[PDB]
Amino acid sequence: GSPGENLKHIITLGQVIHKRCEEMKYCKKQCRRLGHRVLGLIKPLEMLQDQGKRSVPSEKLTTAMNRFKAALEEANGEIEKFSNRSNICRFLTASQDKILFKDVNRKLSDVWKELSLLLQVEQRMPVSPISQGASWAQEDQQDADEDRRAFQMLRRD
Ligand SMILES: CO[C@@H](c1ccc(C(C)C)cc1)c1nc2ccc(C(=O)O)cc2[nH]1
């Protein structure tokens, strides 16, 4: 079953990244951006329900959100795997880019901006406070740039 309690799970899924990012060590510097950004997504959605009783618009919106809830599985899941030491180099060397959750963060912004329009019309929540609007990938590359360099010189674990 998926009662009202689910509302707390969906929002928690995105929060899990915040703590998961702390677990990392090497690429932890890069993931830090993914966890800080993702937090701003379920931030308003979490506090919302906190305001009063079960806060949720029409069911039609549930469908759009269903796509976002899964978006977290991508980041969270990836973090669990990346947690390893060799796995990091595996992708790093098997990817011209430097960021680990590059493609992941990409969809994250889409799943958010996709439901945002529905959230702004459904609920009185001021979406896109300031952090949104511009792709967070641009800045993500900066961190990954230096993060990748340091990785070059990593013998021990
Ligand atoms: C995936 O969508 C979630 C959801 C999560 C967060 C939000 C914030 C407040 C915008 C809104 C909606 C959701 N929609 C629902 C509709 C009905 C019921 C019900 O009790 O029958 C439960 C629901 N859960």
Residue 56 in contact with residue 118, Cβ under 8 Å?
Answer: no
Which helix (H) or strand (E) covers residue 104, if one does?
A: helix 102-122
Ligand 1, pocket-test mutation among 62, 68, 120, most atoms within 8 A of CB: 62
Q: What are the sequence ranges of the domains in the chain?
A: 1-157
Ligand 1: which residue has its CA nearest to atom 22?
A: 4
User: CB under 8 Å, gap of 24 or more: what pairs does 57-64 form?
Assistant: 57/118, 57/122, 57/123, 58/122, 61/115, 61/118, 61/119, 61/122, 64/114, 64/115, 64/118
Residue 71 in contact with residue 114, Cβ under 8 Å?
Answer: no
Method by which the model was determined: NMR
Residue 157 in contact with residue 85, Cβ under 8 Å?
Answer: yes
Structure tokens at 3: 């009662």
Ligand 1 midpoint to CA 73 (Å): 18
Ligand 1, pocket-test mutation among 5, 7, 11, 60, most atoms within 8 A of CB: 7
- Which of 97, 41, 32, 48 lies closest to 69 in space, CA to CA? 41
